[PDB]
């Protein structure tokens, strides 16, 4: 049947993980979505001619490392590591999220895409060049998005799917 891809959106509180997921599916920008709601969403799309089903986990809640939390994140096939272009701390927190993904997946190679969100704001504090070069050192794609305007939203999620299937052919 149809290929299902399990996507997990990770990143600091307030970078726009919920706003990105809601934009991808409903095509609307939500200004205040409950920071505490973690939920799975579903969308069927065509990526490079393949019809597939996305199973997107929009993460929220507390940092905790129980066995059950670990195993849950371990079911994810690829990860959107989201920072905000106006929050340097959310960008420097990226190393941490990638390290946790690598730990539970028990692999140095895990399908991932780096997402710099809020590209519509005029006062950035992380340069594209800086994030591009970090992304290049990880060997992963980098995409700047806006959940306000939709710029880059489809490309971010679709490129993660590409990374997963390029990792499956191994
Ligand atoms: C949404 C929950 N969350 C998370 N915060 C943090 O760290 C927050 C900071 C702030 C200083 C202390 N700490 C360390 C670092 F300095 C950054 N790390 C998280 C994290 F690593 C994951 C994770 C990812 C991939 C995986 F394979 C696994 S496996 C497993 N057991 C995970 C866990 N947990 C996990 C997740 C998860 F699961 F949802 F994806 C959520 C995390 C909130 C807490 C408040 N936040 C914030 O931004 O506060 C300003 C973000
Ligand atoms: N201007 C702008 N604001 C955004 C963008 N994405 C999210 N936001 C806002 O940032 C705040 C937190 O976003 P949210 O989706 O809840 O982030 P989350 O905690 O990672 O799920 C909210 O006020 C959103 O409306 C964006 O691309 N541009
Ligand atoms: Mg949220």
Swiss-Prot record:
Pfam families: Ras. Its EC number is 3.6.5.2. It is found in: Cell membrane; Endomembrane system; Cytoplasm, Cytosol. Changing residue 61 to R: In CFC2; characterized by a defective GTPase-activating protein sensitivity and a strongly reduced interaction with effectors. Glycans are attached at residue 36. Changing residue 118 to N: In colorectal cancer samples; somatic mutation. This is GTPase KRas. It comes from Homo sapiens (Human).
């Amino acid at each position: 049947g149809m290929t299902e891809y399990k996507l997990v959106v990770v990143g600091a509180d307030g970078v726009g993980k919920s706003a990105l997921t809601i934009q991808l599916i409903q095509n609307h920008f939500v200004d205040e979505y409950d920071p505490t709601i973690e939920d799975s969403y579903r969308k069927q799309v065509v990526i490079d001619g393949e019809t597939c089903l996305l199973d997107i986990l929009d993460t929220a809640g507390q940092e905790e490392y129980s066995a059950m939390r670990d195993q849950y994140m371990r079911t994810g096939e690829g990860f959107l590591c989201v920072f905000a272009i106006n929050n340097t701390k959310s960008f420097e927190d990226i190393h941490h999220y990638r390290e946790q993904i690598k730990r539970v997946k028990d692999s140095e190679d895990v399908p991932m895409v780096l997402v710099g969100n809020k590209s519509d704001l005029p006062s950035r504090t992380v340069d594209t060049k800086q994030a591009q070069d970090l992304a290049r050192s990880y060997g992963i794609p980098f995409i700047e998005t806006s959940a306000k305007t939709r710029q880059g939203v489809d490309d971010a999620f679709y490129t993660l799917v590409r990374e997963i299937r390029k990792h499956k052919e191994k």
